[PDB]
Coordinates of C-alpha atoms in Angstrom, one line a residue:
Chain A
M1 CA 79.7 164.5 128.6
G2 CA 82.9 166.5 128.3
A3 CA 84.9 163.5 129.4
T4 CA 87.7 164.3 131.7
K5 CA 87.9 167.9 132.9
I6 CA 91.5 167.8 133.8
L7 CA 94.1 168.6 131.2
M8 CA 92.1 171.4 129.6
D9 CA 92.8 174.3 131.8
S10 CA 96.1 172.8 133.0
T11 CA 99.1 175.1 132.5
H12 CA 101.7 172.7 131.3
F13 CA 99.1 171.3 128.9
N14 CA 98.3 174.8 127.6
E15 CA 102.1 175.4 126.9
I16 CA 102.0 172.2 124.9
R17 CA 98.8 173.3 122.9
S18 CA 100.5 176.6 121.9
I19 CA 103.2 174.8 119.9
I20 CA 100.7 172.6 118.0
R21 CA 98.2 175.5 117.3
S22 CA 101.0 177.9 116.3
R23 CA 101.7 175.6 113.4
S24 CA 99.2 175.4 110.6
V25 CA 99.2 172.2 108.5
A26 CA 97.2 172.2 105.4
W27 CA 95.3 168.8 105.0
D28 CA 94.0 169.8 101.5
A29 CA 97.5 169.8 100.0
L30 CA 98.6 166.6 101.7
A31 CA 95.4 164.9 100.6
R32 CA 95.7 166.1 97.0
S33 CA 99.3 164.9 96.6
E34 CA 98.1 161.7 98.4
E35 CA 98.7 160.7 102.0
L36 CA 95.0 160.9 102.7
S37 CA 91.8 161.3 100.7
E38 CA 89.6 164.4 100.2
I39 CA 86.9 163.0 102.6
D40 CA 89.4 162.8 105.6
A41 CA 90.6 166.5 104.8
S42 CA 86.9 167.9 104.4
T43 CA 86.1 166.4 107.8
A44 CA 89.1 167.7 109.5
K45 CA 88.4 171.2 108.2
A46 CA 84.8 171.1 109.1
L47 CA 85.9 169.9 112.6
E48 CA 87.8 173.2 113.3
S49 CA 84.6 175.1 112.4
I50 CA 82.4 173.2 114.9
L51 CA 84.8 173.9 117.8
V52 CA 85.0 177.6 117.4
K53 CA 81.3 178.1 117.1
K54 CA 77.9 176.4 117.1
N55 CA 76.7 172.7 116.8
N56 CA 79.1 166.1 115.7
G57 CA 80.6 162.7 116.6
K58 CA 79.8 161.7 113.0
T59 CA 83.0 163.5 112.0
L60 CA 84.9 161.1 114.4
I61 CA 85.4 158.3 112.0
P62 CA 87.3 160.1 109.1
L63 CA 89.6 161.8 111.7
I64 CA 90.4 158.2 113.1
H65 CA 91.0 157.2 109.5
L66 CA 93.4 160.1 108.9
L67 CA 95.5 159.5 112.0
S68 CA 96.2 155.9 111.2
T69 CA 96.8 156.1 107.4
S70 CA 99.2 159.3 107.5
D71 CA 102.6 159.0 109.1
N72 CA 103.2 162.7 109.3
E73 CA 103.6 164.0 112.9
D74 CA 102.5 167.6 112.2
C75 CA 99.1 166.9 110.7
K76 CA 98.4 164.0 113.3
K77 CA 99.3 166.3 116.2
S78 CA 96.8 168.9 114.9
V79 CA 94.1 166.3 114.2
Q80 CA 94.7 164.7 117.8
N81 CA 94.8 168.1 119.5
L82 CA 91.4 169.1 117.9
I83 CA 90.0 165.7 119.2
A84 CA 91.3 166.4 122.7
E85 CA 89.7 169.9 122.7
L86 CA 86.3 168.5 122.0
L87 CA 86.6 165.5 124.2
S88 CA 86.9 167.6 127.4
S89 CA 84.5 170.4 126.5
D90 CA 80.7 170.0 127.3
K91 CA 80.0 173.1 125.3
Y92 CA 81.8 171.7 122.3
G93 CA 81.9 168.1 121.5
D94 CA 79.4 166.2 123.9
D95 CA 78.4 163.9 120.9
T96 CA 82.1 163.3 120.1
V97 CA 82.7 161.5 123.4
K98 CA 79.7 159.1 123.1
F99 CA 81.1 157.8 119.8
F100 CA 84.3 156.4 121.2
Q101 CA 82.6 155.1 124.2
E102 CA 79.8 153.0 122.4
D103 CA 82.3 151.2 120.2
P104 CA 85.7 150.2 121.8
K105 CA 87.2 149.8 118.3
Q106 CA 87.9 153.5 117.8
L107 CA 89.7 153.6 121.2
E108 CA 92.0 150.6 120.2
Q109 CA 92.5 152.6 116.9
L110 CA 93.3 155.8 118.9
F111 CA 95.9 153.7 121.0
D112 CA 97.6 152.8 117.7
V113 CA 98.5 156.4 117.0
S114 CA 100.2 156.4 120.5
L115 CA 104.0 155.9 120.4
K116 CA 104.8 157.9 117.3
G117 CA 107.4 160.6 116.4
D118 CA 107.7 163.7 118.7
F119 CA 107.1 163.7 122.5
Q120 CA 104.2 166.1 122.2
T121 CA 102.4 163.4 120.1
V122 CA 102.6 160.7 122.7
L123 CA 101.1 163.1 125.4
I124 CA 98.0 164.1 123.4
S125 CA 97.1 160.7 122.3
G126 CA 97.8 159.3 125.9
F127 CA 95.4 162.1 127.4
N128 CA 92.5 161.0 124.9
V129 CA 92.9 157.2 125.7
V130 CA 93.1 157.8 129.4
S131 CA 89.8 160.0 129.3
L132 CA 87.7 157.1 127.8
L133 CA 89.2 154.4 130.2
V134 CA 88.2 156.3 133.3
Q135 CA 84.6 156.7 132.1
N136 CA 83.1 153.6 133.6
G137 CA 81.4 152.4 130.3
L138 CA 84.7 150.9 129.2
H139 CA 87.9 149.6 130.8
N140 CA 90.8 147.5 129.5
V141 CA 93.7 146.6 131.7
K142 CA 95.8 145.5 128.6
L143 CA 96.0 149.0 127.3
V144 CA 97.2 150.4 130.5
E145 CA 99.7 147.5 131.1
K146 CA 100.9 147.7 127.5
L147 CA 101.4 151.5 127.4
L148 CA 103.4 151.1 130.7
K149 CA 105.9 148.5 129.2
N150 CA 106.8 150.7 126.3
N151 CA 110.0 152.8 126.0
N152 CA 108.7 156.2 124.7
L153 CA 106.0 157.1 127.3
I154 CA 108.3 156.1 130.2
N155 CA 111.2 158.1 128.7
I156 CA 109.1 161.3 128.6
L157 CA 108.0 160.6 132.2
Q158 CA 111.6 160.0 133.4
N159 CA 112.7 163.6 132.3
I160 CA 111.8 166.2 134.9
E161 CA 113.8 169.1 133.6
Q162 CA 110.9 170.0 131.3
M163 CA 108.0 170.7 133.7
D164 CA 105.5 170.0 130.8
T165 CA 106.5 166.5 130.2
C166 CA 106.4 165.2 133.7
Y167 CA 103.3 167.0 134.7
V168 CA 101.1 165.4 132.0
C169 CA 102.6 161.9 132.4
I170 CA 102.2 161.6 136.2
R171 CA 98.6 162.7 135.8
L172 CA 97.7 160.2 133.0
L173 CA 99.1 157.3 135.3
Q174 CA 97.5 158.6 138.5
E175 CA 94.0 159.2 136.9
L176 CA 93.8 155.7 135.8
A177 CA 95.0 154.6 139.4
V178 CA 91.7 155.9 140.9
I179 CA 90.0 153.0 139.5
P180 CA 90.9 150.0 141.7
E181 CA 91.8 147.4 138.9
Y182 CA 94.8 149.4 137.3
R183 CA 96.5 149.7 140.7
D184 CA 97.6 146.0 140.4
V185 CA 99.0 146.5 136.8
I186 CA 100.5 150.0 137.4
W187 CA 102.5 148.4 140.4
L188 CA 104.2 145.9 137.9
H189 CA 105.9 148.7 136.0
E190 CA 106.6 150.7 139.4
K191 CA 110.3 150.3 139.4
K192 CA 110.6 152.4 136.4
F193 CA 108.5 155.6 137.2
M194 CA 108.9 155.4 141.1
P195 CA 112.4 156.7 141.6
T196 CA 111.7 159.7 139.4
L197 CA 108.5 160.4 141.4
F198 CA 110.7 160.4 144.5
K199 CA 113.3 162.7 142.8
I200 CA 110.7 165.5 142.2
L201 CA 109.8 165.3 145.9
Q202 CA 113.4 165.4 147.2
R203 CA 114.2 168.1 144.7
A204 CA 111.5 170.3 146.4
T205 CA 112.9 169.7 149.9
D206 CA 116.4 171.0 148.9
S207 CA 115.5 174.1 147.1
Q208 CA 114.5 176.9 149.5
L209 CA 110.8 178.2 149.5
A210 CA 112.3 181.6 150.7
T211 CA 113.1 182.3 147.1
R212 CA 110.9 181.9 144.0
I213 CA 112.0 180.0 141.1
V214 CA 109.5 179.2 138.5
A215 CA 110.4 175.6 138.2
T216 CA 108.9 174.3 141.6
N217 CA 108.6 176.5 144.6
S218 CA 105.5 177.7 146.5
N219 CA 103.8 178.7 143.2
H220 CA 101.0 176.8 141.7
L221 CA 103.1 174.7 139.1
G222 CA 105.3 173.2 141.8
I223 CA 102.5 172.6 144.2
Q224 CA 100.7 170.5 141.6
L225 CA 103.9 168.5 140.7
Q226 CA 104.5 167.4 144.3
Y227 CA 100.8 166.6 144.8
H228 CA 100.5 164.4 141.7
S229 CA 103.5 162.3 142.7
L230 CA 102.3 161.8 146.2
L231 CA 98.7 161.0 145.0
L232 CA 100.0 158.3 142.5
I233 CA 101.9 156.8 145.5
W234 CA 99.0 156.9 147.9
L235 CA 96.7 155.1 145.6
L236 CA 98.9 152.0 145.1
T237 CA 99.6 151.9 148.9
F238 CA 95.8 151.5 149.7
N239 CA 96.1 147.7 148.9
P240 CA 97.5 145.9 152.2
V241 CA 100.3 143.8 150.6
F242 CA 101.6 146.6 148.3
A243 CA 102.2 148.9 151.2
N244 CA 104.4 146.4 153.2
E245 CA 106.4 145.8 149.9
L246 CA 106.7 149.7 149.4
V247 CA 108.5 150.2 152.8
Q248 CA 111.0 147.3 152.3
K249 CA 112.0 148.4 148.8
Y250 CA 111.8 152.2 148.9
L251 CA 112.9 152.8 152.4
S252 CA 115.4 155.5 151.9
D253 CA 113.2 157.6 149.6
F254 CA 110.1 156.9 151.8
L255 CA 111.7 158.5 154.9
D256 CA 111.9 161.8 153.0
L257 CA 108.1 162.3 153.3
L258 CA 108.5 163.7 156.9
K259 CA 110.7 166.4 155.5
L260 CA 108.2 167.5 153.0
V261 CA 105.5 168.1 155.7
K262 CA 108.0 170.2 157.6
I263 CA 109.1 172.6 154.9
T264 CA 105.6 173.1 153.3
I265 CA 102.6 175.1 154.6
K266 CA 100.6 173.5 151.6
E267 CA 97.8 171.4 152.9
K268 CA 97.9 169.3 149.7
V269 CA 101.5 168.2 149.9
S270 CA 101.5 167.6 153.8
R271 CA 98.2 165.7 154.4
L272 CA 99.2 163.3 151.7
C273 CA 102.8 162.7 153.2
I274 CA 101.4 161.9 156.6
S275 CA 98.5 159.8 155.2
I276 CA 100.9 157.6 153.0
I277 CA 102.9 156.8 156.2
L278 CA 99.6 156.1 158.2
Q279 CA 98.5 153.6 155.6
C280 CA 101.8 151.6 155.9
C281 CA 101.7 151.7 159.8
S282 CA 98.2 150.2 159.8
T283 CA 97.1 147.1 161.5
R284 CA 95.8 145.7 158.2
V285 CA 99.2 145.7 156.6
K286 CA 101.4 142.6 157.0
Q287 CA 104.5 143.0 159.2
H288 CA 103.5 146.3 160.6
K289 CA 105.5 145.9 163.7
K290 CA 108.7 145.9 161.6
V291 CA 107.9 149.0 159.5
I292 CA 107.0 151.0 162.7
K293 CA 110.4 150.3 164.3
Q294 CA 112.2 151.2 161.1
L295 CA 110.3 154.5 160.7
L296 CA 110.5 155.6 164.4
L297 CA 114.2 154.7 164.8
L298 CA 116.0 155.8 161.6
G299 CA 113.6 158.4 160.2
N300 CA 113.1 160.0 163.7
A301 CA 109.4 159.7 163.0
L302 CA 108.2 159.8 166.7
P303 CA 110.1 163.1 167.6
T304 CA 109.1 164.7 164.2
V305 CA 105.3 163.8 164.8
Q306 CA 105.3 165.0 168.4
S307 CA 106.7 168.4 167.3
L308 CA 103.9 168.4 164.5
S309 CA 101.1 167.9 167.0
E310 CA 101.6 171.4 168.5
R311 CA 101.7 173.1 165.1
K312 CA 98.6 171.7 163.3
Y313 CA 97.1 172.8 160.0
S314 CA 93.8 174.4 159.5
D315 CA 92.1 171.4 157.8
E316 CA 90.6 168.9 160.2
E317 CA 91.5 165.8 158.2
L318 CA 95.2 166.8 158.4
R319 CA 94.9 166.9 162.2
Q320 CA 93.3 163.4 162.3
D321 CA 96.2 161.9 160.4
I322 CA 98.8 163.6 162.7
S323 CA 97.0 162.2 165.8
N324 CA 96.3 158.6 164.5
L325 CA 100.0 158.2 163.3
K326 CA 101.4 159.5 166.5
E327 CA 99.5 156.9 168.6
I328 CA 100.6 153.7 166.7
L329 CA 104.4 154.5 166.7
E330 CA 104.5 155.4 170.5
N331 CA 102.0 152.6 171.6
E332 CA 103.8 149.9 169.8
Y333 CA 107.3 150.2 171.3
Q334 CA 106.4 150.7 175.0
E335 CA 103.5 147.9 175.0
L336 CA 106.2 145.1 174.4
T337 CA 107.7 143.5 177.6
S338 CA 110.8 145.2 179.1
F339 CA 112.7 142.1 179.8
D340 CA 112.1 140.7 176.3
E341 CA 113.5 143.8 174.5
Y342 CA 116.7 144.0 176.7
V343 CA 117.5 140.3 176.2
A344 CA 116.8 140.4 172.5
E345 CA 119.2 143.4 171.8
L346 CA 122.1 142.1 174.0
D347 CA 122.0 138.6 172.4
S348 CA 121.9 139.5 168.8
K349 CA 124.6 142.1 169.6
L350 CA 122.7 144.9 167.8
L351 CA 121.8 147.8 170.2
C352 CA 120.0 151.1 169.6
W353 CA 118.2 153.5 171.9
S354 CA 114.3 153.2 171.8
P355 CA 111.3 154.8 173.7
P356 CA 111.1 152.4 176.6
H357 CA 114.8 151.3 176.3
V358 CA 115.9 154.6 177.7
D359 CA 113.2 154.9 180.4
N360 CA 114.2 154.7 184.2
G361 CA 111.3 152.3 184.8
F362 CA 112.6 149.7 182.3
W363 CA 115.6 149.1 184.4
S364 CA 113.8 149.3 187.7
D365 CA 111.6 146.3 186.9
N366 CA 114.3 144.3 185.1
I367 CA 117.1 144.3 187.9
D368 CA 115.7 141.5 190.0
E369 CA 115.1 139.3 187.0
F370 CA 118.8 139.5 186.0
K371 CA 119.9 137.6 189.1
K372 CA 120.8 134.0 188.4
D373 CA 124.5 134.0 189.0
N374 CA 125.0 137.4 190.7
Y375 CA 123.3 139.6 188.0
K376 CA 124.6 137.3 185.1
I377 CA 122.7 139.1 182.3
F378 CA 124.1 142.6 183.5
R379 CA 127.5 141.1 183.7
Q380 CA 127.3 139.9 180.1
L381 CA 126.4 143.5 179.0
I382 CA 129.6 144.9 180.8
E383 CA 131.5 142.1 179.1
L384 CA 130.0 143.3 175.6
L385 CA 131.2 146.9 176.2
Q386 CA 134.6 145.6 177.2
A387 CA 134.9 143.3 174.2
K388 CA 133.9 146.0 171.5
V389 CA 136.6 148.5 172.5
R390 CA 139.5 145.9 172.5
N391 CA 138.4 143.8 169.5
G392 CA 138.2 145.3 166.1
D393 CA 139.2 148.8 167.6
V394 CA 136.8 151.7 168.0
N395 CA 135.4 154.5 165.8
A396 CA 134.1 152.0 163.2
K397 CA 130.4 152.8 162.5
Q398 CA 128.9 149.6 163.9
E399 CA 130.9 149.3 167.0
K400 CA 130.5 153.0 167.9
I401 CA 126.6 152.8 167.9
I402 CA 126.6 149.9 170.5
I403 CA 129.1 151.7 172.9
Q404 CA 126.8 154.7 173.5
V405 CA 123.8 152.5 174.1
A406 CA 125.7 150.0 176.3
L407 CA 127.0 153.0 178.3
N408 CA 123.4 154.5 178.7
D409 CA 122.1 151.1 180.0
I410 CA 124.9 150.6 182.5
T411 CA 124.4 154.2 184.1
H412 CA 120.8 153.6 184.8
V413 CA 121.3 150.1 186.4
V414 CA 124.3 151.4 188.6
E415 CA 122.5 154.5 189.8
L416 CA 119.6 152.2 190.7
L417 CA 121.5 149.4 192.8
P418 CA 124.7 149.9 194.9
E419 CA 125.6 146.2 194.4
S420 CA 126.5 146.8 190.9
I421 CA 129.7 148.5 192.0
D422 CA 131.2 145.0 192.8
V423 CA 130.3 143.8 189.3
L424 CA 132.2 146.6 187.5
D425 CA 135.3 145.8 189.6
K426 CA 135.1 141.9 189.3
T427 CA 134.6 141.9 185.5
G428 CA 136.9 144.8 185.0
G429 CA 134.5 147.2 183.4
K430 CA 135.3 150.0 185.9
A431 CA 138.8 150.6 184.1
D432 CA 137.3 150.3 180.6
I433 CA 134.9 153.3 181.4
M434 CA 138.1 155.6 182.3
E435 CA 139.5 154.9 178.8
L436 CA 136.1 155.7 177.2
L437 CA 136.4 159.4 178.4
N438 CA 139.6 159.6 176.2
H439 CA 138.0 157.8 173.3
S440 CA 136.8 160.2 170.6
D441 CA 133.3 161.5 169.7
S442 CA 131.2 163.8 171.9
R443 CA 128.3 161.2 172.6
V444 CA 131.0 158.6 173.6
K445 CA 132.8 160.9 176.2
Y446 CA 129.4 162.2 177.3
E447 CA 128.1 158.7 178.0
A448 CA 131.5 157.8 179.7
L449 CA 131.3 160.8 182.1
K450 CA 127.7 159.9 183.1
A451 CA 128.9 156.2 183.4
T452 CA 131.7 157.3 185.7
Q453 CA 129.7 159.8 187.9
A454 CA 127.1 157.0 188.8
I455 CA 129.9 154.7 189.9
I456 CA 131.8 157.3 192.0
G457 CA 128.7 158.3 194.1
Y458 CA 128.3 155.0 195.7
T459 CA 132.1 154.4 196.4
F460 CA 132.7 157.8 198.2
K461 CA 129.7 160.1 199.2
Chain B
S1 CA 87.3 196.7 141.9
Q2 CA 88.7 196.9 145.5
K3 CA 85.3 196.9 147.3
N4 CA 83.7 194.4 144.8
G5 CA 86.5 191.9 145.0
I6 CA 86.7 191.6 148.8
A7 CA 83.0 190.5 148.7
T8 CA 84.0 187.9 146.0
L9 CA 86.9 186.6 148.1
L10 CA 84.5 186.4 151.1
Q11 CA 82.2 184.3 148.9
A12 CA 85.0 181.9 147.8
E13 CA 85.8 181.1 151.5
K14 CA 82.2 179.9 152.1
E15 CA 82.3 178.0 148.7
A16 CA 85.7 176.5 149.6
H17 CA 84.2 175.0 152.8
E18 CA 81.2 173.9 150.9
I19 CA 83.2 171.8 148.2
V20 CA 85.1 170.2 151.0
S21 CA 81.9 169.5 153.1
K22 CA 80.1 168.1 150.0
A23 CA 83.1 165.6 149.4
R24 CA 83.2 164.8 153.2
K25 CA 79.3 164.0 152.9
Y26 CA 80.0 162.0 149.6
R27 CA 82.5 160.0 151.6
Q28 CA 79.7 159.2 154.2
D29 CA 77.4 158.0 151.4
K30 CA 80.2 155.7 150.2
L31 CA 80.2 154.1 153.7
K32 CA 76.5 153.3 153.5
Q33 CA 77.0 151.9 150.0
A34 CA 79.5 149.4 151.4
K35 CA 77.0 148.1 154.0
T36 CA 74.1 148.0 151.4
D37 CA 75.9 146.1 148.5
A38 CA 77.4 143.7 151.2
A39 CA 74.1 143.0 152.6
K40 CA 73.2 141.9 149.1
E41 CA 76.4 139.8 148.6
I42 CA 75.6 137.7 151.7
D43 CA 72.1 136.6 150.7
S44 CA 73.3 135.9 147.1
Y45 CA 76.0 133.7 148.7
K46 CA 73.3 132.0 150.8
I47 CA 71.5 130.7 147.6
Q48 CA 74.9 129.9 146.2
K49 CA 75.2 127.5 149.2
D50 CA 71.6 126.4 148.8
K51 CA 72.2 125.6 145.0
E52 CA 75.1 123.2 145.7
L53 CA 73.1 121.7 148.7
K54 CA 70.0 120.8 146.5
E55 CA 72.5 119.4 144.0
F56 CA 74.1 117.1 146.6
Chain C
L1 CA 97.6 199.3 144.0
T2 CA 95.8 200.4 140.8
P3 CA 92.5 198.7 139.8
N4 CA 94.4 196.5 137.2
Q5 CA 97.0 195.3 139.7
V6 CA 94.4 194.4 142.4
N7 CA 92.3 192.6 139.6
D8 CA 95.2 190.5 138.7
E9 CA 95.9 189.7 142.3
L10 CA 92.2 188.8 142.6
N11 CA 92.1 186.3 139.8
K12 CA 95.1 184.4 141.1
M13 CA 93.8 184.3 144.7
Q14 CA 90.2 183.0 144.2
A15 CA 91.8 180.6 141.8
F16 CA 94.2 179.1 144.5
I17 CA 91.4 179.0 147.2
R18 CA 89.0 177.2 144.9
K19 CA 91.4 174.9 143.2
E20 CA 92.9 173.8 146.6
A21 CA 89.4 172.9 147.9
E22 CA 88.6 170.9 144.7
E23 CA 92.0 169.0 145.0
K24 CA 91.3 168.3 148.6
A25 CA 87.9 167.1 147.7
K26 CA 89.4 164.6 145.4
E27 CA 91.7 163.4 148.2
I28 CA 88.6 162.8 150.5
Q29 CA 86.8 160.6 147.9
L30 CA 90.2 158.9 146.8
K31 CA 90.2 157.8 150.5
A32 CA 86.4 156.8 150.2
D33 CA 87.4 154.3 147.4
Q34 CA 89.8 152.8 150.0
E35 CA 87.2 152.7 152.8
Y36 CA 84.5 151.3 150.4
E37 CA 86.7 148.2 149.7
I38 CA 87.8 147.8 153.3
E39 CA 84.4 147.9 155.1
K40 CA 82.7 146.0 152.4
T41 CA 85.4 143.4 152.6
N42 CA 85.2 143.1 156.5
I43 CA 81.5 143.0 156.8
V44 CA 81.2 140.4 153.9
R45 CA 84.0 138.2 155.3
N46 CA 82.6 138.1 158.9
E47 CA 79.3 136.8 157.6
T48 CA 80.6 134.5 154.9
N49 CA 82.7 132.7 157.7
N50 CA 79.4 132.1 159.6
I51 CA 77.6 131.1 156.3
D52 CA 80.4 128.5 155.5
Chain D
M1 CA 107.4 187.5 146.2
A2 CA 107.1 187.2 150.0
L3 CA 103.5 187.2 151.5
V4 CA 102.9 190.2 153.7
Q5 CA 99.9 190.6 156.0
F6 CA 99.5 193.9 157.7
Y7 CA 96.9 195.2 160.2
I8 CA 96.0 198.5 161.9
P9 CA 92.5 200.0 162.8
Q10 CA 90.7 201.7 160.1
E11 CA 91.1 205.7 160.1
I12 CA 94.8 205.6 159.6
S13 CA 94.4 203.1 156.7
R14 CA 95.2 205.9 154.3
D15 CA 98.3 207.1 156.2
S16 CA 99.5 203.5 156.8
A17 CA 99.0 202.6 153.0
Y18 CA 101.2 205.7 152.2
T19 CA 104.1 204.9 154.4
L20 CA 104.1 201.3 153.1
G21 CA 104.0 202.6 149.3
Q22 CA 107.2 204.5 149.6
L23 CA 109.0 201.5 151.1
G24 CA 107.8 199.2 148.4
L25 CA 104.4 197.6 148.6
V26 CA 102.6 196.4 145.5
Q27 CA 99.2 194.7 145.0
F28 CA 97.6 196.3 148.1
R29 CA 94.2 194.7 148.7
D30 CA 92.3 195.1 151.9
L31 CA 90.8 191.9 153.3
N32 CA 89.4 190.7 156.5
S33 CA 91.1 188.1 158.9
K34 CA 88.3 185.8 157.9
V35 CA 89.3 185.6 154.2
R36 CA 92.3 183.3 154.6
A37 CA 91.7 180.1 156.6
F38 CA 95.1 180.7 158.2
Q39 CA 94.5 184.1 159.9
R40 CA 91.5 182.6 161.8
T41 CA 92.0 182.0 165.6
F42 CA 92.9 178.4 166.4
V43 CA 93.9 176.7 169.7
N44 CA 96.9 175.6 167.5
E45 CA 98.6 179.0 167.5
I46 CA 98.2 179.5 171.3
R47 CA 100.4 176.4 171.7
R48 CA 103.1 177.8 169.5
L49 CA 103.1 180.9 171.9
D50 CA 103.4 178.5 174.9
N51 CA 106.5 176.8 173.2
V52 CA 108.0 180.2 172.3
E53 CA 107.8 180.9 176.1
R54 CA 109.6 177.5 176.7
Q55 CA 112.4 178.8 174.3
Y56 CA 112.6 182.0 176.2
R57 CA 112.9 179.9 179.5
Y58 CA 115.7 177.7 178.1
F59 CA 117.7 180.7 176.8
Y60 CA 117.7 182.3 180.4
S61 CA 118.7 179.0 181.7
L62 CA 121.6 178.7 179.3
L63 CA 122.9 182.3 179.9
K64 CA 123.1 181.7 183.6

């Protein structure tokens, strides 16, 4: 069989094997002074001789015996390593793999030896248990849920300042996630691993690719770390509920994906960032209209996507994801009624620019509709711009957002209809605009100058 | 190894495409599997309904 | 330069090209696990509504 | 370790190599444009050139 083929040729895993193999622990002596019996030591020795050359899983049972009975981390790491070496190779230790797999008992026994002494120990064991679970002849959710709840495996995972630790841990979790059933239990323990997964990704964005560090750059080690994190994510997000839940909790961290796509050339990192967003924007996902607004507006998703479309990546699939995501965000905002959007923002008092909220057409259609008591709705808007400046001052975060928007809306309407000029004068908005030129911030004086020039043009040609 | 290796890198580009294409075709098989095992789940749900009909 | 230096450069490169395709290949069939549940679930549901 | 890709016609390959050596070039391996996916001709790269021309138009515009 040769079980799982990952974590055999993997570099961080090889670094961990050197430490274990460097050290030589004599079983014969331990066994003689008692910590184990002669039969367990004879088997362990014979086991080294099979791996290096020539032709058992019959050997499996005394090694399981040794692991449990001894408490000594050095012998147990050497026994566990040898077991790992066989499990993955299909040149050495095909028979070994079968022996676990037939009888679930030696797996539960192998799970025992997990959560013991040194951090290397917990990795090796975790690697062997994870290899049998993903073979489709056995599965147990309880093992995976249980291993998740624990302190020691999550502590190792949390550290990212040792490449080796993180690399193995994210991979164990993720490999298991491929199989649909785990996705549900893995998500329960999310809140522990998930900020850390986000931290590796952010960490990559900030450190320039123009250099080379050996920790995570454009070299093979870094490329895998980013990939693994994103892959673990993508997998959970495939379920329709989970994806809605992901956006609402992790929002800040989530927006950072757009950034990854931009700095990398790596088709592994980028495809997955765009894809994870595409899944959450999907029709299938509950409250997709909300998530789409949030992404486009805050995260600048639409502008970022449009720029991407010109500079596509060689692989086709990457192109498909760029095109499909681009369509939902854009379609969604414009296809809602113009009158609805305008009334909804003014009433709640929360205003922000949006794709059809800045279009000339939006206003053109909506002017007539306003009239009910001489453009009563427009008049309420001028009243809102007036109110904000006087009450609660100006250059407070909230109140400043509204002013620029309110001023954009009033230019378009005024430039469109000459009758609007009376409305500014009656309400007293015309004076408020003159003050706004003087009121700080570039976007504010910019909008005020546009607001003034539209008014002037109809008074005096 | 200059004029052996270039031929080797040339071969890797064709093999690279091929791994990807074989996974893109595996995907396509998965789609048929979905339509096949679903065609089977409906007529096993028919007899589920026929079972509690002959009981009533 | 030398035959050793180009050889080294050779093992790293064909490794990256090949590994990258294998990792992409995984991503395609990770996505095939999602589409398998999704089409199967749609198709079954449409008919089971009619069966009910 | 910054990726360099360099091209010329073959004949002056030897005299090109040389001038490069003395400036600091290591791990010189001749390839073809085919070998990396990225140095193949795509519609994608022609659009970048069109955008680069837009930059050039906006720079004149501003200098004026």
